[PDB]
Amino acid sequence: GMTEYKLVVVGAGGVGKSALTIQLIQNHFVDEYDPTIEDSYRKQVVIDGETCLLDILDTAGQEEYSAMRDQYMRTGEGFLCVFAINNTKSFEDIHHYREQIKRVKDSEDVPMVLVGNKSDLPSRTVDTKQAQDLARSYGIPFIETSAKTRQGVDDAFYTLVREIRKHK
Ligand SMILES: C[C@H]1CN(C)CCN1c1cccc(-c2noc([C@@]3(C)CCCc4sc(N)c(C#N)c43)n2)n1
Ligand SMILES: Nc1nc2c(ncn2[C@@H]2O[C@H](COP(=O)(O)OP(=O)(O)O)[C@@H](O)[C@H]2O)c(=O)[nH]1
Ligand SMILES: [Mg+2]
């Protein structure tokens, strides 16, 4: 049968979670997507010759640490932790999202990729070396993306699928 991979995109509001998700789903850059919409989107893709079914949860909204929301995020098999390279605060938030993933999955070994988005912009405030070194601290891959130009989009999602395959 065709394997389905539940991927969850997390990170601060405005970093480009929706734009990255829609680039993968539509193959089109959407510069405007209702920032409150949290939804899931499926796509059949060939990763390493294998046709598999991606189920991408594009998260949104305020913090909620209820049993219900925990249960919901627990369905995720792998996570993209997204920050924007021109927003220091979104990068400084990453450790929170990682800590909540570790908590709800009850594991130090959850498939995860650090994503530096908006790589097309000249307004960088987060050094690539700082981002690579944070991924190194966590033992996870780091991928530089632009939802605008599609730079790195497949790399980010496909790497996460590969991390899930390993973890199994
Ligand atoms: C960085 C912090 C703290 N900061 C002081 C204010 C802004 N902020 C925000 C603001 C909005 C959201 C979040 C947030 N945190 O985790 C989560 C996610 C979705 C990640 C995946 C695992 C779990 S499990 C659970 N119940 C979650 C929930 N909700 C989460 N979303 N965090
Ligand atoms: N230049 C540029 N703008 C982006 C990129 N990704 C998202 N944006 C913009 O960043 C803002 C927030 O994007 P959005 O997808 O809503 O972020 P979300 O809140 O994380 O879902 C919008 O103004 C988008 O047009 C990117 O890679 N490059
Ligand atoms: Mg969004």
Residue numbers in the entry: 0 to 167
Question: Can you list sentences taken from the study reporting this PDB entry?
Answer:
KRAS mutations are among the most frequent gain-of-function alterations found in patients with cancer and their therapeutic targeting has long been a key objective in precision oncology. The KRAS GTPase cycles between an active (GTP-bound) and an inactive (GDP-bound) state. Here we report the discovery and characterization of a non-covalent inhibitor that binds preferentially and with high affinity to the inactive state of KRAS while sparing NRAS and HRAS. The pan-KRAS inhibitor works by preferentially targeting the inactive state of KRAS to prevent its reactivation by nucleotide exchange.
We began by removing the covalent warhead from the G12C-selective inhibitor BI-0474 and applied structure-based design optimizations to obtain a potent non-covalent inhibitory activity. Although the removal of the covalent warhead (precursor 1) greatly reduced the potency of G12C inhibition, we were surprised to find that the warhead-free scaffold indiscriminately inhibited proliferation driven by the noted KRAS variants, albeit with a low potency (half-maximum inhibitory concentration (IC50) ≥ 1 µM). The crystal structure of precursor 1 in complex with wild-type (WT) KRAS showed that the piperazine moiety was suboptimally positioned between the carboxylates of E62 in the Switch II motif and D92 in the α3 helix of KRAS. Furthermore, we observed a highly coordinated water molecule near the C5 atom of the pyridine ring (3.6 Å). We thus proposed that the potency of precursor 1 could be enhanced by improving its interaction with E62 and by introducing an acceptor functionality at C5.
